[PDB]
Symmetry: C6
Subunit: 68 residues, 6 copies
Amino acid sequence: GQMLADPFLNALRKEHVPVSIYLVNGIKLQGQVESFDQYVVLLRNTSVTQMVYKHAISTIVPARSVNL
Amino acid sequence: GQMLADPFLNALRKEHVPVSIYLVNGIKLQGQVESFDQYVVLLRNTSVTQMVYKHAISTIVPARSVNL
Amino acid sequence: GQMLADPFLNALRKEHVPVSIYLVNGIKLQGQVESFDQYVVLLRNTSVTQMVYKHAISTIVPARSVNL
Amino acid sequence: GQMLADPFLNALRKEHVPVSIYLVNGIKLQGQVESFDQYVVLLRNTSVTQMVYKHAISTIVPARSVNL
Amino acid sequence: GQMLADPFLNALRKEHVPVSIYLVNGIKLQGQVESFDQYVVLLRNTSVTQMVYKHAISTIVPARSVNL
Amino acid sequence: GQMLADPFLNALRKEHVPVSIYLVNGIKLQGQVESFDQYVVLLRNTSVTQMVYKHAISTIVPARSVNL
């Protein structure tokens, strides 16, 4: 397929679906997808919005499926 | 050879073959290949469809060979 | 979205917000974002300014959110 | 040198030389090189043909040298 | 910012400042920056000059800050 | 600097200098640099010539410095 990663993150962002982001070092982050660009995902939890590099993400697991 | 990765994922997707996706952090994911694009594989199990970055995949092991 | 990583690092740099930079090897660095370019972030603490490769950064966690 | 990786994998493929493929997570795969493209190696053992991403391969060790 | 990584390594090289280079596998190298190019840093210690791939470097920590 | 990685590997290859190649998974390989291309280094020891992906190499340590 073509051009699927952005619709997936946009659906999560617009529907406010909580996610778990598993990083290549074994860190698991949880929060809301606030925004993203070519390189990063901005992930907000109750404390702060942090900047996650896509190159370090292995998988993004939503709390429920988003229908693209 | 040339242009083999997409036929392999497409065969898995169309034939509904279960896979194991081994990630660079040692996580093993199991499910169905729902879709893919240049950067990601959408992997569905009984809970959710998650977005897996190809850069984090080491190997994809089908439950049976697909014949391309 | 588009062109978000540079506004985020610039806000941190200009507002002097302390950060934690988590690296893919499990090192956590703390300090101030002094500068950055296409490839690196220069991170200053009380000892020195060190050069961090973006490819090795998983997430940058500010002490407080920056509003872009 | 120039253009050596494809002759090496092609020699292994055509001569049916068993290989060990060491991945960046510490997995060692064994089998035959069935095919490859810009991004992947298809590796067959007695069970299945699996798709290995080149980005995850550290070294490919043949059972004997191939003479290119 | 723009074009900062080369001035940083050049300052270290010209001023003979000792560095610690932390690699993604957890190796820490120490020595002098002898030279660098698009892909590598040549790092000299009392034994030898070794070739370090930038893709494997997480952070370069000078013994003192260099002023660019 | 510019265009240093190839002169370094070529000097090792032509002078038959033994090397240690440290990989991102912690494997250390030893042998002779037989050849290289844009993506790989062919490393020969007494058993076989193996194909090492540059993306997986952290540092190459010669038994003695090569003078470029």
